[PDB]
């Protein structure tokens, strides 16, 4: 009677996209989309700001495949600015490359809300960073809203992203602060334990829908966490996402940080949450594990974009915006 | 909210047929039905157009038991036309046999939308094929709609089927194109990975219902994919299907293509999706595996038809059309 | 849309009974109920008409504990009438015993719709059977409806049950035929494969509710099949059942037919569906053949199952079976609950 | 010490045959061998005398492929003699490797016990044209078996006689002395066998064959009965001293084997049970009752087994069965190997 | 090398009995044997002195089938003597194979320790009419057991005495010189036993029986105590040199065994625990586990299945009497593959 149930929230496995009239072949579809209101990517993939996913090596390949990588903040201001420079000064000895006005590969960097943030932001913009990601566990906070407002007023020459959020109210708050894009994701990550530890969360399909409906395409959103297959990406874009941030899928690849480990005859790479005991050294909100060796990241990216191309062919979507505006879904049961 | 949820789509496991007043015994029911608006079968079974399910041997046996087999297109025009001739020229040394006006066993053949289709269609009709199946992964496309219209206009002496579809709008499109029957099924196949790779699909009970409700019995529909038991067949017919296409159930049988393999003391036969890496040599949308040796196909067909007879006895359906028009269902939970 | 979905049907695991104001202790509740409009039992338990559950030995113990056993029809007319006689002529060398007007232990017998049915029915009534169970897989048939009408017209001195059913329309049909009780159950049995083979069924809580709502307490119903625990029995009675038929729970007990088998150090007894390949030896099987572990004397299982139903009546404030039947309140639970 | 350990007995998995100098290709080897001192087979395979393995159908297919079937005794004298006649009167509607008698009729064997109906059974089988009488019990080193084989040889010298089951050299000499034309070796190795657990009796098959063969000194052949899972076991058995191999498990589940195909959980199976199981007897049971997967025509399985044996003879440099029997060299392997 | 490896010790699963020439059918064999030098049983079966196996009910049933029951010591002197009286005063309201004394009363045995209450316990049990006193500890080759056995024989010559538990020939000779009428063999083979893990002490049962039997030279019989899972183990034990077999696990879970039936996860069970478990003791570290065995129903069924299997074994070896199997059995050693 007094319990407030806002809605029955839906995840990726709760829905399926419906096929519609199509005259487009998967090989002919355009994967071009917008990361912010000022930055466009050639593929809707964004590599996760994590110490086991993105560093300079991963950020180069992402951009080289038409996407973008967000360097993690679990490194000192000097280390992060040095990683930005490595991506910006990289020269090929890739026609679908994601580059700036000066023909340099695009890169992003993650920042907190704390005391070293003004020095961190200044050093990253100076190093030539394209986008600043003001990212915490709870983006619907004065700390994130006001830190986003600070970066837009003091550094208008750089694009700013606010995260993480899962409601329409949070999106309007960050829109008013001057965010160029919002990062959507509260509890969906594969290594995430936020739901068990805090009982806080919002299944990703309803999270994207809530944010996208409030924004009214004024700024794009990044669907962050919980992508296991190429089908999830199509559902995310269909629900309202402009891009998709992945961690698990890019972890274990050659380009990801960490050396290959030989455990029980097989090859693995470490994969851990940024809120895990190992990543922090608050009660932990993430796990530490090992993912199998996937080889060059290019293979995984091609296989994922291949699946999204087929989905766009099934929905009759020639461009990303066609899938975003015309997608029709069906709700499925546990049997389906 | 901006998210468009058309309906809560239902699969076979989501529903159960209700028993109704009955004066008919299972051994007395008529399994006679229509494959197309010109072809009638003695049983509602159709063998899948797959390189591990239907070739000349399987088509003969399907036709001998009162069903029909669709010859696969993973062979050259000359091989496919020779397979049509093998079934049409077959002479028994079977009172329920499915035969044409000339007393020859009935056969069907699958065609694509590619460049070799006019030469393939012409050679199959010349070889005496009863039905042409214009089938792709996405039948709600200009490619399938216009090819179905081409076959009907250029070869009116042959029956044409369009597939695969899962919506009422797709059915009306193929109906207006001149299809004699529609093939329903987007994502329910046992070897299918369309749902994981593309995030596209429609649970089979809701797919059949949507198609059947739009058609208004103007042309029949084949419920294609996802049949595991004889109960699924009864649910499919009750939902609106006239015939049922099966791959998994007929794979592993003596008549199915492929030699028996002796693995770990047991006997198996290969079973693979037509969108698998092995079948194509687009990102794969099917798996490759082994099914246990089932022996002569006749046994499996009799067990399946036996179960459908019991269901018609429970519903008080003397004829297939009684189950199609009078069936009443209940929705069941994950506990049921 | 043209698809006809009558309702979202519920099973035992879909619901939970709510506790209500209570002044009654579980040890003080009355388990007395009615099998038919003429037969009353001291406990709501009925043993299944199965060749691995009820024969003379099981019907005696069920009647001794307050219940009733239904003898199976997978035996000739002479064998079945002899089994009726064994129960009726049994003398103790049990205060809650279910007995007739002549002080003899009560017994039931299953009959089909086939050609031997008039000879079978006549021989069972002559042997002193209390209730005739006209039992097939599909009781909403002319075969069952007309046979129940034949038994009532030709043998009014005996009580008649019709089954199996799962809808209100089927219940009204058997009520108009003169059935004294209806047996509810289409697809909930533990050994049943009707749902996989025919795609036919009705989850038991919705089946009981549909039948009970149509009947309006004119004749009782036997909730037949799908009982795994004592909680299911309380849910069944709360949904509208007057009695409960069990097979799996009484299988494996000392009293059940079959000799104990020593497999891999443990002790088991056979348990099979009446539509299995082995039980039938035409129709495709609709039941499985298996082994249940040895449970020892049936008395232990009956006491545990009646103990659980007593606690439930204590939780609902139900002093008598009719209090649970008329006052029970439920909540629907998800797959998480 | 008082404990008498005769030897460390070896099974199939304890040994491996060594490859030796070879000039023979597997396709060129001769699989011809002797079943008895008077009967020769074209392949060293025998189908077990079991109610789920050999009846007339299996015996015809066995004979057609160059082997022989031993019809089971779990049927009356009239039915068993009718099964012998069915094999002897069989005419092809082509099998060049067919095992046939002097009159060009397919060869067949029949199992007999030591019971009271044995003289009537033996007389009726010889009259029906049986080629070999198998006096087979669980314990062939008994007065019952020894004297019955001696009775068959003295009263019916026109027929070949086999004695079994045995596992020692002393048992072989006893049966050789009574006039057996061949001995059957196997105490405890059967796949469905529980003799080892129930009686604590047994002898691993490689040591059982070796013990029997060493005592006989090729005077009469021996049949390696039980425990064959793969084509490699057959080569090890022949190398150890066997002239033929009896199989039950491998031929069970085939089209030709007795029993109808059963559809359990989507798959196809056939029954397979020990002759000392509760079901086969209706002594404490010494065998289990189970289901084997449907293998289709027996011909496929036989070709796979004879193919594997051909490769083995190619590896050993064995042109004829007798070359493998006399020249095979083995190595003992550990639990790691 | 300085490490002393006495032998490669063998268990039940390491050996198989060989079939030999036979003229006697399993239904015709004699299962009669001797428990002590003065007591004979009609079947070679003894129920274990455990609080979840043998109380008066199990002992009555054991004797009625021709065996004997050893009453446990995890009860006061008055209760144990009352259990002896219950078996001795039992009268049938038919069991032709019953194991009875000179006065036609069902035979019974009782377990005693080496503790301070032992003289009062022994005196009260003999007074109650006990047939055999079992001086049983975890280690029978101790001054405590040897001297207590010697005390019982000297002070109560009218009663039979058993000494246990032992696993060597030296131990057997020590108890033989003490005046034991029979020895109980079993160090570490118990199903609920953890002696091997806790102390690293043990001797596989086939070699334990062989070592004891070879030293004794049939002067006194031995009871194969512990590690019997099937009827085949019993035949191997007798063939190795045992006159009787003590079983705990096989008789636990039966109707006659102490404890009420428990309904866990739809099934019926009875408790079964080691006498050296935490629960049985309530300052030695535990040497046994506490568990549940499935409900087996009347003990008669289990006993008939075991004696049936042993009958077949004697019919395979050509053993008309127990002594034929004991003296003529031939074995083969098998590998992990066999
Ligand atoms: C330890 C935990 N770790 C992380 C780390 C990275 C994360 N990244 C994303 C998400 C979204 O599920 C959660 C995350 C939690 C974490 O930051 N908790 C956490 C919980 C509640 C609040 Cl209000 C805050 N504010 C930002 C101070 C932080
Ligand atoms: C590789 C995959 N393979 C298959 C093959 C056979 C199938 N057969 C049936 C179904 C039913 O979902 C799917 C199938 C997918 C496939 O064809 N994908 C696919 C995906 C989207 C589009 Cl728009 C198209 N159009 C026909 C060009 C094809
Ligand atoms: C083979 C099966 N076997 C059984 C046997 C006993 C049963 N007893 C109860 C139930 C309740 O689901 C089903 C049963 C099925 C069975 O009777 N099928 C069956 C199916 C449909 C109809 Cl219309 C009929 N009519 C009565 C002739 C019979
Ligand atoms: C019940 C058992 N069943 C079988 C049946 C077939 C067998 N066939 C082969 C083997 C060899 O392991 C054992 C078998 C046991 C069986 O015959 N026991 C059995 C045990 C010992 C003896 Cl002395 C005898 N004599 C012949 C009377 C019989
Ligand atoms: C706790 C343990 N419990 C038991 C109880 C009964 C047993 N019964 C048999 C066996 C055979 O290993 C071991 C047993 C251990 C036990 O008594 N240990 C134990 C260990 C070493 C010694 Cl020298 C002694 N002496 C008698 C004082 C006792
Ligand atoms: O420890 C953590 N707790 C919760 N979420 C985390 C943690 N570390 C990273 N994340 C989020 O999870 C995403 C990775 O999601 P995934 O692709 O499902 O592995 C990241 O991009 C973050 O938004
Ligand atoms: O690779 C594939 N991907 C998806 N669906 C497939 C593929 N190959 C065949 N199918 C469909 O799956 C059906 C077989 O369904 P099944 O009876 O559930 O095995 C075929 O008749 C096709 O409609
Ligand atoms: O083979 C069969 N198929 C379907 N239902 C069966 C079969 N045999 C018995 N039944 C039903 O299942 C009940 C037993 O239900 P249980 O208590 O869940 O084991 C019986 O009382 C019958 O109503
Ligand atoms: O119940 C039984 N107990 C023990 N051995 C058996 C039984 N029935 C048959 N056998 C033997 O086991 C053989 C079959 O061995 P398999 O090829 O390993 O299955 C038969 O030829 C018999 O010698
Ligand atoms: O806790 C214990 N530790 C070790 N052995 C025990 C314990 N309790 C009883 N035993 C022995 O184990 C035997 C039971 O053996 P079982 O038949 O294999 O269960 C008893 O007769 C004792 O000799």
Numbering used by the authors:
A (entry chain B), B (entry chain A): 0 to 92, 206 to 393, 413 to 467
C (entry chain D): 0 to 92, 206 to 393, 412 to 467
D (entry chain E): 0 to 92, 205 to 393, 413 to 467
E (entry chain F): 0 to 92, 205 to 393, 412 to 467
Sentences reproduced from the published study:
GuaB catalyzes the oxidation of the substrate inosine-5´-monophosphate (IMP) to xanthosine 5´-monophosphate (XMP) using NAD+ as a cofactor, and guanosine 5´-monophosphate (GMP) synthase converts XMP to guanosine 5'- monophosphate (GMP) to generate guanine nucleotides essential for cell growth and viability. Indeed, genetic studies have shown that de novo guanine biosynthesis is essential for growth and viability of bacteria both in vitro and in vivo (10–23). Here, we present the first high resolution co-crystal structures of A. baumannii, S. aureus, and E. coli GuaB proteins (cystathionine beta-synthase (CBS) domains deleted), each determined with a matched set of three different inhibitors bound. Similarly, the NAD+ binding region, also where our compounds bind, occurs at the junction between neighboring molecules with side chains from both protomers contributing to ligand binding interactions.
The A. baumannii protein consistently crystallized in space group P21 with eight copies in the asu, forming an octamer composed of two inverted tetramers, relatively rotated to interdigitate the labile “finger” loops (residues 371–381) that mediate much of the tetramer:tetramer interface. This Glu residue underpins species selectivity, because the human homologs (IMPDH1/2) contain a Gln residue at this position that effectively prevents binding. Differences in the polarity of a particular key selectivity residue specifically (Ser250 in E. coli versus Ala252 in S. aureus and Ala249 in A. baumannii) was found to be critical for inhibitor interaction with GuaB which corroborates the observations of previous reports. Enzymatic mechanism of inhibition studies showed GuaBi binds to A. baumannii GuaB uncompetitively with respect to IMP, and via a mixed non-competitive binding type with respect to NAD+. GuaBi exhibited dose-dependent bactericidal efficacy against A. baumannii in vivo.
